């Protein structure tokens, strides 16, 4: 503990943090009460709900820890790992971080010299932009 460096989290960094990808909104099946596959709470991405106990029934013991069963993919380990591991969601279309915009001009910064009304009308799909022009080609 010497310095808590902080900064913008690029897409590559968030991918590196993630141990998988979240593809469904499922949380838990209404009958077995167990986390679903590839949704929220999934053990294949976050961790085993019980200590060293996988999902499909294959491994229930502490002896053979640190292994990945090919059936459900849950990596047997302590249940505490669920508190540490985190996932990510891949958006089909990019979006903007609400924090940096919609605020004072020390965080937004006028990095693009456009009024806040313009951004509000552009990022929420109410007006177009000219991202680039071949002005030299037009003049030629």
């Amino acid at each position: 503990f010497d310095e808590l460096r902080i900064g913008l989290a690029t897409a590559d960094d968030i991918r590196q943090w993630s141990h998988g990808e979240v593809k469904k909104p499922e949380t838990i099946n209404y009958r077995t009460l167990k986390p679903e596959k590839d949704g929220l709470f999934c053990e294949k991405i976050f961790g085993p709900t019980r200590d060293w106990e996988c999902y499909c029934g294959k491994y229930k013991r502490v002896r053979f820890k640190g292994i990945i069963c090919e059936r459900c993919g849950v990596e047997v380990t302590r249940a505490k790992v669920r508190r540490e591991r985190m996932g990510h969601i891949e958006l089909a279309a990019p979006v903007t971080h609400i924090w940096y915009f919609k605020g004072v001009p020390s965080r937004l910064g006028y990095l693009l010299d456009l009024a806040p009304k313009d951004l509000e009308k552009v990022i929420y799909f109410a007006a177009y932009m000219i991202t680039f022009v071949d002005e030299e080609r037009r003049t030629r």
């Binding site: 503990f1 310095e3 460096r5 913008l8 968030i14």
Partner: protein, 115 residues
């Protein structure tokens, strides 16, 4: 005779239930809850210069999952109290701020740090 009887107010706690989202002790009398060490309490302890009492009152006595079992074991076995670890609420904070797209990296002077 008022209803502010001492029997209702008397509460005590060696160690009891703990909260879930954050591993600190939960409050109340019905659930064996530790008293809160507010912001002004830590200010007052800083005014004395007592850093070690603060360090145990923030780490050993709450918010550190690995430390509580160890300190109970050491007290019972008579061994000296072990070194406190990092707290859990700080880990929760860094994990949360990592979830706002802020790559909060804990680094050492000589490259990466050991935790």
């Amino acid at each position: 005779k008022l209803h502010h009887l001492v029997d209702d107010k008397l509460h005590a706690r060696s160690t009891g239930p703990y909260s879930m989202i954050t591993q600190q002790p939960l409050g109340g009398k019905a659930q064996f809850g530790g008293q809160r060490f507010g912001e002004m309490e830590v200010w007052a302890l800083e005014a004395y210069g007592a850093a070690y009492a603060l360090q145990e009152l923030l780490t050993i006595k709450s918010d550190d999952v690995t430390g509580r079992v160890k300190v109970y074991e050491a007290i019972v076995k008579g061994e000296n109290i072990p070194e406190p670890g990092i707290p859990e609420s700080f880990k929760v904070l860094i994990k949360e701020m990592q979830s706002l797209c802020l790559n909060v990296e804990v680094l050492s002077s000589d490259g990466m740090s050991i935790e």
